[PDB]
């Protein structure tokens, strides 16, 4: 009946190694050396025996209190260990012709993300009393694999940059991270994300403006950081390193609105990136400083002629659909006192308020 | 003029003599893959004529290398009708295309001797 | 001038062809030791051995062409004279990486043998090439190693010996496969397993002694079959011959053969052909499927076959571009044998290429001799693309695949759609001329026979030193030819006429159907064509023509061995210039033969080496073509050894076959070589026959040694049509149609 | 107008059951006459597909002096092309009489060999003409040498 919790035991009761398969593949191939090995092998043979872990434990606790008492020896000692191994020879792989060389790459991801998927997978919910994560001492490995989900969009392909591959990176990083928060010891973390926390982070926001010209190519290394750090919205520990950069490096964000708007800089892609920029930022700063920055904003032959209403108005005709969506999004009423005490204004904001909330929400 | 009406009418009559394949003889096949083939450089001919003719100015001193580039690397398997035949439409080239750009010597001679060459082996 | 033609080659740099100068050196240097070994002299012998050893890396060089003059080049260079101690060891390293890495393949046989003893410096030089190609994509010469290597190890030092140990060492892994595919497929029928192996021992039982450890081991294969189908040999290797027949046969089967180990009697040679025939009839009755197909029916299909590189066998090719096409993947379980020589089994190869591919199984029967000829047919018909005339009329003549895997077995390719006009051109006479009582088994070709004995002394298994008189041979083939062979004249017309639906394509494919007998007719009288009745040429119902599949019997064998007095340039039945309309055209077909004929004359090299290494290289070929015969028919074997007593079929058949190409008309001076044994005024003058009145003396006459284009052909075609010839060889060439 | 089958089958129904019906002899000789009025049209209509299939159609019928009395190869072989050497094979069995008998050349069937050639030859394949020509010219005598 309890499938799992039932069968599981007479096994057991049966055997207890009477389930794992094959033995590694990293020596063997440095004796064969083949191309059928990048089909099966760094395919199926790592990730079949990862996908029976992944369902296995979702089951029953059976990786929790009778996996822990399998083996700490002979045949053992070549399992999920050196699996890991395969995952520090995934990150190196993954970074070292056409199709083949292709499929080398889509392969070395769809791998590679499964088992970020279970390292999450397992974490935030094999180890329930937490004293599992304990068992897996290369927990080095997947720590300085995972986080470069920067460094990853590099080595993995640009390609799935593309191919909706990193329209699941984003929520595989939500996932490990995810496993991150709050469940292990917090000092994981800054092992983890304290190895380039700020320092790049003012250097390379800072330094769109900075760059100017050639900015698209750069705006792709922004827009990673951007992005990346929206995945740190799902994260923890942003709390310690990144409300004192809200206060002041978000409000810097906002800055980076109002120099940049004078100059239109850049193309509608940047024009994009304010979008982002603003978003990742106001999905942590205050509201009070932005709205405050609306009628504060405004009160600070054609080219200062129009200027005088610009300043006044793009900045929320761009920007707009984001602001609406970004105030109306954490709280009503404060809105209103915002509005009213601008005057005048009012009904830009509050036409895109009452009409951009109308279609978001049914 | 004249020269139109009938290469367009025995065009029209290979296209009459393209009806029968069951079982095709290579003469069904390779003698009109080849006549076409003549027939090929005949209309291009025409063409770049009254083009070079009435180009530019003196352009035809510059373009043009575009047809014997194109009539160079035309190839035969076996039958002895190609690598004669072309010689016929190609001399006709000589002469005509030398009487059309008359209306940067020593070029033209190196350029007719590289016609002469390949045209033996 | 050659001097002056070649190294300035490599001193200009841009192009001018290393082969265009290169090989033509290598054909000169070539035929002056040829022509020297002809002869022995002072000057002949000294400015001789200046000339040779020159041409022998040039021919490395310039190995982008075609390659296999080459892969006949290097065991030429080796065996010919002084075989270099250095020289070839390292620039022939350098080669197959220089060249083609797949020029390495290009003398599958060649190597394997070469490796052990053929090479003797290999275990030296070609060890190591064989060894930096060996272990990345070669999986095929993994096939061949394991049947040359195992047979002699002949004398060593230390390295030479345990390298080639290692390398068939891997072959047992990452080839394990190898051997459980072979250990697989070594089926089938019971018969041509005892019947074979008891005439290979038992023709080894009856001379001087020899028969210690020959005797000793010859036992234990059989013993395998019978000693171990339920002892651990084949709980390792089970069948489902070995399931009931090798067990309800290992009751009786132990005692009778226990009893021969220690039998050692030469008169019993002759006695276990009581018990032999007794199982013969009884292991025809079961041949009847259901036993390897089951036993087959076991596929991996695992882990991409746990990588596995095993092809359609022999399907690692010639030319270069070696790109692994094709692949195993699993079989269709139903299985059919059929009604054939060794009783063969269709085999189905489901390929993995979003294609399957039907093979053969012949496990009696060691596919050797016939490789070299298979491969020397696509140099056939891969040489004519460079004659015109070849080209102009589309003239190939189809090839395939010969497998040769295991010394004792190997499997072969299968067109659908190719029949025996035999076959079909007897049911489908059948369906129209009368239900099946026609007149086959009454009174015409049994009525010819017992005529025919009627003639000579007794028995049929003389006539030999009968067959007289020139008027009543006009009589036999006048009766029979006539009546007999315009019956399927009718029936064979009739037979394209009914598969061609349209009333023309009858008509039209009949030029691919001759064009095609055109082709294979030249293809003999470039070699002997024996046990190549008519059921052995058959046709391809497709474009309707005609393909050649038999080779048990090469040049003379065809025609020389006397058990079997056999002589004709190719199979000129009656009932097919029958079915040529009232033609005439066939006399000028003559054509076809002709610029075929010189399309073949004008380079000997190629041809002339690709027949040396062939003739003088396979055992299969005279040190055991006795094996071949004998292994086909009994009457062979008494009669073969006590002809073939300290006499050697190599050399001469070579030269007596390219002296074939240069101008030896009428076949005349082939008829005499053929001759020359048994007996010279009882056949020798009857092959005259053909040659002697006047009508046909045009076949003597014409003969002339001066390199004559259409001569050889003018009378090799009445020299087909002397019915003298067809009436009195065999009763299965059918002559009568 | 492509089932040629029902002009095949309609001189089989034609043909057979004027060999089943009543008397025969006259009317055999009768329905010879008409290889005339198929002749008479090969020499009215030019350039026209079906009267080939007329051909086929002819050859098919059991016989003579439509393979005599035809010149199609002159005309049915302009256009027909592969239809017209079908001719030849029916026409050589009873037409050309003189051929499997061994006769003189002086009776053999004179025409009715060149036709096929000259239609063997405008399909100047790559073994039709080249054979043909040898062949009917073979068919009497000082070829061998001009050969």
Not at chain 1, 135 to 146: A, I, S
Not at chain 3, 246 to 257: I, P
Not at chain 3, 600 to 616: I, Q
Not at chain 3, 701 to 709: A, T
């Amino acid at each position: 009946k309890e499938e799992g919790v039932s069968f599981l035991i007479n096994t057991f009761e049966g055997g207890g190694c009477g389930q794992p398969s094959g033995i590694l593949a990293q020596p063997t191939l440095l004796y064969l050396r083949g191309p059928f090995s990048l089909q099966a092998t760094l395919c199926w043979l790592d990730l079949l025996l990862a996908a029976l872990e992944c369902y296995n434990t979702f089951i029953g606790e059976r990786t929790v209190g009778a996996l822990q008492v399998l083996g700490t020896e002979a045949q053992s000692s070549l399992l999920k260990a050196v699996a890991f191994f395969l995952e520090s020879i995934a990150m190196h792989d993954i970074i070292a012709s056409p199709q083949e060389g292709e499929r080398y790459n889509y392969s070395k991801c769809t791998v590679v993300v499964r088992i970020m998927e279970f390292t999450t997978t397992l974490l935030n919910t094999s180890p329930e009393g937490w004293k599992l994560l304990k068992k897996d001492l290369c927990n080095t490995h997947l720590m300085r694999v995972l986080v470069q989900t920067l460094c990853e969009p590099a080595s993995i392909g640009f390609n799935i940059g593309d191919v909706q591959v990193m329209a699941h990176l984003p929520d595989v990083c939500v996932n490990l991270m995810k496993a991150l928060k709050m469940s292990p010891y917090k000092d994981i973390l800054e092992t983890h994300l304290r190895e380039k926390i700020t320092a790049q982070s003012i250097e390379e926001l800072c330094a769109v403006n900075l760059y100017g010209p050639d900015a698209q190519v750069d705006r792709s290394r922004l827009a990673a950081v951007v992005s990346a750090c929206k995945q740190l919205h799902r994260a923890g520990l942003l709390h310690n390193i990144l409300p004192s950069q809200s206060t002041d490096l978000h409000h810097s964000v906002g800055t980076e609105l109002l120099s940049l708007v004078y100059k239109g800089i850049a193309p509608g892609d940047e024009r994009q990136c304010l979008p982002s920029l603003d978003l990742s930022c106001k999905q942590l700063a205050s509201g009070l400083l932005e709205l405050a920055f609306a009628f504060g904003g405004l009160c600070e032959g054609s080219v200062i002629h129009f200027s005088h209403g610009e300043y006044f108005y793009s900045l929320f005709s761009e920007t707009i659909n984001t602001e609406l969506l970004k105030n109306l999004d954490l709280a009503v009423l404060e809105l209103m006192q915002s509005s009213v005490d601008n005057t005048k204004m009012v009904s830009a904001v509050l036409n895109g308020m009452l009409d951009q909330s109308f279609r978001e929400r049914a | 003029d004249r020269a139109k009406y009938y290469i367009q009418n025995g065009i029209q009559s290979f296209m009459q003599n393209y009806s029968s394949i069951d079982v095709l003889l290579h003469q069904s096949r390779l003698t009109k893959l080849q006549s076409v083939q003549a027939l090929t450089e005949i209309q291009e001919f025409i063409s770049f004529i009254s083009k070079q003719g009435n180009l530019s100015s003196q352009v035809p001193l510059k373009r043009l290398l575009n047809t014997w580039t194109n009539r160079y690397p035309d190839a035969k398997m076996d039958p002895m009708n190609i690598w004669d035949d072309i010689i016929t439409n190609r001399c006709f080239f000589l002469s005509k295309i030398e009487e059309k750009l008359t209306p940067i010597s020593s070029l033209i001679r190196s350029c007719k001797f590289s016609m002469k060459m390949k045209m033996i082996d | 001038a050659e001097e002056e033609a070649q190294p300035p080659s490599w001193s200009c740099g841009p192009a001018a062809g290393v082969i265009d100068a290169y090989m033509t050196l290598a054909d000169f240097c070539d035929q002056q030791l040829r022509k020297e070994e002809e002869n022995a002299s002072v000057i002949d012998s000294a400015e001789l051995q200046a000339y040779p050893a020159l041409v022998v890396e040039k021919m490395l060089k310039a190995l982008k062409l075609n390659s296999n003059e080459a892969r006949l080049k290097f065991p030429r260079l080796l065996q010919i004279i002084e075989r270099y101690p250095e020289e070839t060891l390292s620039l022939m390293t350098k080669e197959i990486s220089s060249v083609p890495c797949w020029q390495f393949i290009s003398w599958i046989s060649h190597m394997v043998a070469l490796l052990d003893k053929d090479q003797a410096v290999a275990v030296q030089h070609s060890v190591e090439e064989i060894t930096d190609n060996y272990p990345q994509a070669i999986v095929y010469p993994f096939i061949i190693s394991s049947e040359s290597y195992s047979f002699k190890d002949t004398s060593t030092g230390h390295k030479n010996k345990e390298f080639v140990a290692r390398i068939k060492s891997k072959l047992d892994q990452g080839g394990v496969i190898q051997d459980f595919i072979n250990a697989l497929d070594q089926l089938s029928n019971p018969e041509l397993l005892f019947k074979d192996w008891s005439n290979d021992v038992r023709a080894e039982l009856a001379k001087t002694p020899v028969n210690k450890k020959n005797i000793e081991k010859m036992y234990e294969r059989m013993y395998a079959a019978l000693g171990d189908p339920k002892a651990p040999g084949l709980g390792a290797f089970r069948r489902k011959f070995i399931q009931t027949f090798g067990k309800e046969f290992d009751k009786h089967f132990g005692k009778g053969g226990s009893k021969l180990l220690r039998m050692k009697l030469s008169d019993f040679n002759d006695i276990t052909n009581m018990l032999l025939l007794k199982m013969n009839k009884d292991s025809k009755p079961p041949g009847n499927l259901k036993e390897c197909s089951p036993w087959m029916s076991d596929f991996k299909v695992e882990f991409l076959r746990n990588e596995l590189e095993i092809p359609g066998q022999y399907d690692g090719r010639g030319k270069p571009l070696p790109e692994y096409h094709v692949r195993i993947a699993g079989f269709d379980e139903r299985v059919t044998v059929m009604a054939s020589l060794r009783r063969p089994k269709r085999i189905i190869i489901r390929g993995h290429d979003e294609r399957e591919h039907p093979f053969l199984v012949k496990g009696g029967e060691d596919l050797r001799q016939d490789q070299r000829v298979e491969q020397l047919f696509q140099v056939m018909n891969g040489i004519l693309a460079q004659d015109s005339a070849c080209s102009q009329r589309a003239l190939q003549l189809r090839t395939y695949s010969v497998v040769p895997m295991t010394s004792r077995l190997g499997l072969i390719e299968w067109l659908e759609n190719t029949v025996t006009l035999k076959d079909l051109l007897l049911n489908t006479m059948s369906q129209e001329e009368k239900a099946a009582y026609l007149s086959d088994p009454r009174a015409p070709p049994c009525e010819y026979k017992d005529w025919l004995t009627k003639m000579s002394g007794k028995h049929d298994v003389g006539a030999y030193m009968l067959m007289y008189k020139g008027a009543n041979r006009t009589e036999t083939v006048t009766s029979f030819r006539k009546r007999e062979s315009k019956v399927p004249a009718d029936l064979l017309k009739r037979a394209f006429v009914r598969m061609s639906t349209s009333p023309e394509a009858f008509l039209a494919l009949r030029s691919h159907f001759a064009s095609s007998h055109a082709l294979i007719c030249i293809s003999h009288w470039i070699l002997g064509i024996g046990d190549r009745h008519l059921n052995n040429f058959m046709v391809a119902m497709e474009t309707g023509g005609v393909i050649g599949i038999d080779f048990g019997h090469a040049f003379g064998s065809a025609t020389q061995f006397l058990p079997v007095p056999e002589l004709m340039p190719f199979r000129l039945t009656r009932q097919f210039i029958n079915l040529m309309l009232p033609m005439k055209e066939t006399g000028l077909m003559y054509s076809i033969m002709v610029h075929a004929l010189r399309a073949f004359r004008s380079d000997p090299g190629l041809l002339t080496n690709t027949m040396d290494v062939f003739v003088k290289e396979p055992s299969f070929d005279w040190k055991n073509f006795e094996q071949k015969m004998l292994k086909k028919g009994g009457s062979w074997i008494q009669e073969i050894n006590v002809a073939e007593k300290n006499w050697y079929p190599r050399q001469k058949i070579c030269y007596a076959k390219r002296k074939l190409a240069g101008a030896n008309p009428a076949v005349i001076t082939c008829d005499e070589l053929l001759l020359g044994h048994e007996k010279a005024p009882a056949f020798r003058d009857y092959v005259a026959v053909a040659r002697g009145s006047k009508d046909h003396n045009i076949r003597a006459q014409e003969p002339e040694s001066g390199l004559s284009e259409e001569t050889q052909v003018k009378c090799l075609m009445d020299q087909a049509t002397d019915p003298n010839i067809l009436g009195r060889t065999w009763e299965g060439w059918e002559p009568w149609m | 107008i492509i089932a040629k089958q029902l002009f095949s089958s309609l001189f089989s129904g034609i043909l057979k059951e004027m060999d089943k019906f009543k008397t025969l002899s006259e009317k055999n000789n009768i329905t010879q006459k008409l290889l005339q009025d198929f002749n008479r049209f090969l020499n009215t209509t030019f350039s026209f597909f079906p009267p080939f299939v007329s051909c086929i159609q002819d050859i098919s019928c059991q016989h003579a002096a439509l393979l005599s009395l035809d010149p199609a190869a002159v005309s049915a072989g302009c256009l027909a092309s592969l239809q017209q050497p079908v001719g030849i094979r029916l026409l050589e069995e009873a037409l050309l009489r003189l051929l499997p008998a061994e006769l003189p050349a002086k009776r053999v069937r004179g025409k009715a060999r060149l036709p096929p050639d000259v239609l063997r030859w405008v399909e100047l394949a790559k073994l039709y003409r080249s054979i043909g020509e040898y062949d009917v010219l073979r068919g009497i005598f000082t070829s061998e040498i001009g050969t």
